[PDB]
C-alpha cells in the first residue's frame, strides 16, 4: 500500500507511515529481561519486555540497548524491537508496506548488510531503502544546500551538502552523543553525592539530563557564577520520593560536546569538527555552508546550544563571513520527517530495492545507496 | 617533626609514622556504646568504647562503624576514632606532625571537605594531604605502570595507571567488599542453620569468613564436589563454645565478588570490571596493563583469588596477550605502605596543604589533589 519509515535510532525508535508530519509511535529502543528470582505470584507473564513496557517496569529488569553508537550489537534484540514495532505500534503487516531505514554515515557495511538481510528474510518487506540520517535531516529542512549536525543518542556525524551534491570526504563522525553525556552525568553526580549505577538509575540520570541540563554560553564565567553561590541550582524528584539538587553539573554534563577531553577523548568539540568539515570542502562552498548550518538529533535540544556553537564558529570562522544556525523546534523528529518526505516523493519510487533485485544479487546489494 | 600516615579504612584503621615498613597501630574502625542498663555495679565507666576496646567487650555494646562503603556518616564517631588514634595509639600530638589521609576514588567532595575541615580545626595539623588508595598501592608495589584493584572492607575500586599518568576516565568503582561478603555469609549461614543477627555476632561471622572462606577456581565444579560429600567441611569454634560446620558456604561467600547477582546487584564481577577498565584505556596501554594487574586490599587475601581472577581475565582477554597478576604478601597494608613511601619523598614535601593555604582558601581547598 503505502511506504512506512522506521528510523531505528540508538536509544529512541521512531516509526510511522510516509506522508505524515510526525512519527506515529516513539518508544525507547530498550529490551528488558527479568533479573530477580523465578517469580512467586505467577499467572501469565513474559520472558522479555520491549519498548515502553520495559521502561514501565524497569525496577525488575536489566535494560540493554541493542544499538550502541549507531551500530547494532545484539541482533536478536534488534529483531525483537523490529517485530514489536511492526506488530504492536504501527499494527500493520510488514509484507505489504515498503520500509525506509536510516543509518549513520561511516558505519560498518556488515551492520547494514545484516539489517537488510534480517528485515528482508525474517519479514517479507516488498522494498527496503537505507539512507543517511543527515541527508534526511536536510530533506526535512526543505533546502538543498547546508551542513547537517545530527547529534543522536549514539553518534554525532556531520555531512555537508551543496546543491544536493553531498561531499563524501568532509564527513566527520563523532562517537560523543547522548549516551556518553548520560554516563558523564552519572560519573559527575557523585560530586554532590547522588550516584546512580543500575540501568534503571541510568534512565533516571537520562531524565535528569533531559529536564535540567543546559549548555552554558561561556563555560568559565558560568562555572565562576555557580561557584559564587548563584541561583543555578534546580531540584529534581526521584521516583522513590527524595529530592536532589543539581548545581554546576547542569552545564558540565553537556559541555563534553564542546570539550571531549572531559572523558579523556582526543577528538575536538562539535564546533571544531563542524568547522573542520566546512574547511575540507571547496573554497566556493564554505560561504554557503556557513550560512546554512542545520541541527538535528535529540541532544541538540539543550537550551543555548545554538548560541554557543554560533559563537564558537564565529570565533573560528573569518569575521567577514555571516554565520547562521538553523535550529527548528522539531529537531527530535527531523530525521523521521525527512524520511517521510523522501519516501513520498514521486522520483524516489524507482530507487527502492525490490525483492527481485535482492534475490538476484543476494544480500550484498545495499552498496549503491551511498550518499 | 615527621609526617604520619593515617589510612582510615571502612572497617580497619591503620596509622603510623612515615618511613616505617608497617603500620604502628591497627585496630577496627568501630565505635561502640553500652546497650544494657547502667546497673548498680559501677566503678569507673565510659559512655563509648572506641577501637579494639569496643571489640574486646563487644557482648554489651552495639558496635557502629563510622565508615561504610568508604564514606563517613557519623562524624562525631569519626572524630572520636581520630582522637583515640592520635592520643592512645600513636601517642603523639597531632599539632606537630603532618597527616596524610586516604580516600577512595569517585567519592563526594563534601565528605573530603568535611574531613579536611575537621582535621584542620579540631586538630591543628601543620599540613595535610588526601590521596587515592589505589595510587598509594601502586606506590607500595614499586612500579609506575599498572592497574590496581583495591578491595577494602567497604569499597572495591580499580584505577589504571600508565607511566605515572593516571587515567581518570577508566576508573571503575564497585560497592562489593568485605562488609557485603560478611552480610552474605550471615544470610547464607542460615542454610546449615547457624545464624548470627547481632553486631557482635556479625563480628563473629566476619572472623569465620576471614579464617575459613576461600575462592574456588571453578564454582560449578566446587559446588558439585561439595554436594558430593567431600572433605570441604571445616569446623569453627564459637566463643560460646559450640562448634559449627561450614560446607559449601566456604566458597559461596567470596563468590559474590565474581557474581554480584547473589545479593541482587546489577553490576558485574570484579574480573569483568577490571577487564572493562583495561578496555577503556588506549590500545597502546592495554598490553602493559594486562601484565601489571596489581592487587591490594584486605578482601583480596582469600586463598586462590589470584588464580581465579587470572583465569577469568585470561578467558576475557585475547589469547595472545600475557596476563600476570601481582599479589604481594603485604596486600592488607599495601595502601599504608604506599602512603608511608609517598609521605617520605623529597618531592612530595612541596605538595602538602599548609595551614596558611587552608586559611586563605577555606575548607574547599582539596580539589587540586585529584588523582
Amino acid at each position: 500500500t503505502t511506504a512506512l519509515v522506521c528510523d531505528n535510532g540508538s536509544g529512541l525508535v521512531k516509526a510511522g507511515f510516509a506522508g505524515d508530519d510526525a512519527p506515529r509511535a516513539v518508544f525507547p529502543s530498550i529490551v528488558g529481561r527479568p533479573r530477580h528470582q523465578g517469580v512467586m505470584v505467577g499467572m501469565g507473564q513474559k520472558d522479555s519486555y520491549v519498548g515502553d513496557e520495559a521502561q514501565s517496569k524497569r525496577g525488575i529488569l536489566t535494560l540493554k540497548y541493542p544499538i550502541e553508537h549507531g551500530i547494532i550489537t545484539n541482533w536478536d534484540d534488534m529483531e525483537k524491537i523490529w517485530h514489536h514495532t511492526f506488530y504492536n505500534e504501527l499494527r500493520v503487516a510488514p509484507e505489504e508496506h515498503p520500509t525506509l531505514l536510516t543509518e549513520a554515515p561511516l558505519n560498518p557495511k556488515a551492520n547494514r548488510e545484516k539489517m537488510t538481510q534480517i528485515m528482508f528474510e525474517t519479514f517479507n518487506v516488498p522494498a527496503m531503502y537505507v539512507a543517511i540520517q543527515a541527508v534526511l535531516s536536510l530533506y526535512a529542512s526543505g533546502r538543498t544546500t547546508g551542513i547537517v549536525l545530527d547529534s543522536g543518542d549514539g553518534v554525532t556525524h556531520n555531512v555537508p551538502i551543496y546543491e544536493g551534491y553531498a561531499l563524501p570526504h568532509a564527513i566527520m563522525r563523532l562517537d560523543l552523543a547522548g549516551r556518553d553525556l548520560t554516563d558523564y552525568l552519572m560519573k559527575i553526580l557523585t560530586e554532590r553525592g547522588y550516584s546512580f549505577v543500575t540501568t534503571a538509575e541510568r534512565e533516571i540520570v537520562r531524565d535528569i539530563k533531559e529536564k535540567l541540563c543546559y549548555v552554558a554560553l561561556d563555560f568559565e564565567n558560568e562555572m565562576a557564577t555557580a561557584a559564587s553561590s548563584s541561583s543555578l541550582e534546580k531540584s529534581y524528584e526521584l521516583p522513590d520520593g527524595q529530592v536532589i539538587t543539581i548545581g554546576n553539573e547542569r552545564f558540565r554534563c553537556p559541555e563534553t560536546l564542546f570539550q571531549p577531553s572531559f572523558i579523556g577523548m582526543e577528538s575536538a568539540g562539535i564546533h571544531e569538527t563542524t568547522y573542520n568539515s566546512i574547511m575540507k570542502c571547496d573554497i566556493d562552498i564554505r560561504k554557503d555552508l556557513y550560512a546554512n548550518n542545520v541541527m538535528s538529533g535529540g541532544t541538540t535540544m539543550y537550551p543555548g546550544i545554538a548560541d554557543r556553537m554560533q559563537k564558537e564558529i564565529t570565533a573560528l570562522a573569518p569575521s567577514t563571513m555571516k554565520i547562521k544556525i538553523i535550529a527548528p523546534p522539531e529537531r527530535k523528529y527531523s530525521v523521521w520527517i525527512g524520511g517521510s518526505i523522501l519516501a513520498s516523493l514521486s522520483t524516489f519510487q524507482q530507487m527502492w530495492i525490490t525483492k527481485q533485485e535482492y534475490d538476484e544479487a543476494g544480500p550484498s546489494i545495499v552498496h549503491r545507496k551511498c550518499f | 617533626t615527621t609526617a604520619l600516615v593515617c589510612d582510615n579504612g571502612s572497617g580497619l584503621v591503620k596509622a603510623g609514622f612515615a618511613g616505617d615498613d608497617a603500620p604502628r597501630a591497627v585496630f577496627p574502625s568501630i565505635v561502640g556504646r553500652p546497650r544494657h542498663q547502667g546497673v548498680m555495679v559501677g566503678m569507673g565507666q565510659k559512655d563509648s568504647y572506641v577501637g579494639d576496646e569496643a571489640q574486646s567487650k563487644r557482648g554489651i555494646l552495639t558496635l557502629k562503624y563510622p565508615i561504610e562503603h568508604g564514606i563517613i556518616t557519623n562524624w562525631d564517631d569519626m572524630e572520636k576514632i581520630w582522637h583515640h588514634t592520635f592520643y592512645n595509639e600513636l601517642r603523639v600530638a597531632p599539632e606537630e606532625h603532618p597527616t596524610l589521609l586516604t580516600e577512595a576514588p569517585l567519592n563526594p567532595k563534601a565528605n573530603r571537605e568535611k574531613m579536611t575541615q575537621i582535621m584542620f580545626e579540631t586538630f591543628n595539623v601543620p599540613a595535610m594531604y588526601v590521596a587515592i588508595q589505589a595510587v598509594l598501592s601502586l606506590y607500595a608495589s614499586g612500579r609506575t605502570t599498572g592497574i590496581v584493584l583495591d578491595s577494602g572492607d567497604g569499597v572495591t575500586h580499580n584505577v589504571p595507571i600508565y607511566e605515572g599518568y593516571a587515567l581518570p576516565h577508566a576508573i571503575m568503582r564497585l560497592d562489593l567488599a568485605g562488609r557485603d561478603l560478611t552480610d552474605y555469609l550471615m544470610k547464607i549461614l542460615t542454610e546449615r542453620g547457624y545464624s548470627f543477627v547481632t553486631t557482635a555476632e556479625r563480628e563473629i561471622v566476619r572472623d569465620i569468613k576471614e579464617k575459613l572462606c576461600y575462592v574456588a577456581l571453578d564454582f560449578e565444579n566446587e559446588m558439585a564436589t561439595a554436594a558430593s560429600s567431600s572433605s570441604l567441611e571445616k569446623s569453627y569454634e564459637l566463643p560460646d563454645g559450640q562448634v559449627i560446620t561450614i560446607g559449601n558456604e566456604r566458597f559461596r561467600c567470596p563468590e559474590t565478588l565474581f557474581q554480584p547477582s547473589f545479593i541482587g546487584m546489577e553490576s558485574a564481577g570484579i574480573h569483568e570490571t577490571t577487564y572493562n577498565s583495561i578496555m577503556k584505556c588506549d590500545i597502546d596501554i592495554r598490553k602493559d596493563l594486562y601484565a601489571n594487574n596489581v592487587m591490594s586490599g584486605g578482601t583480596t587475601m582469600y586463598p586462590g583469588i589470584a588464580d581465579r581472577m587470572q583465569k577469568e581475565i585470561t578467558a576475557l582477554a585475547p589469547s595472545t596477550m600475557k596476563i600476570k597478576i601481582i599479589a604481594p604478601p603485604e596486600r592488607k597494608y599495601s595502601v599504608w605502605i604506599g602512603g608511608s613511601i609517598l609521605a617520605s619523598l623529597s618531592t612530595f614535601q612541596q605538595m602538602w596543604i599548609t595551614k596558611q593555604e587552608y586559611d586563605e582558601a577555606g575548607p574547599s581547598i582539596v580539589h587540586r589533589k585529584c588523582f
Binding site: 554532590r192 553525592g193 550516584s195 536532589i244 | 561504610e68 562503603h69 564514606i71 563526594p108 560497592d175
Partner: peptide
C-alpha cells in the same frame, strides 16, 4: 549516599 544507596 544521599540519593541511591544509604551512605
Amino acid at each position: 549516599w544521599x540519593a541511591x544507596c544509604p551512605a
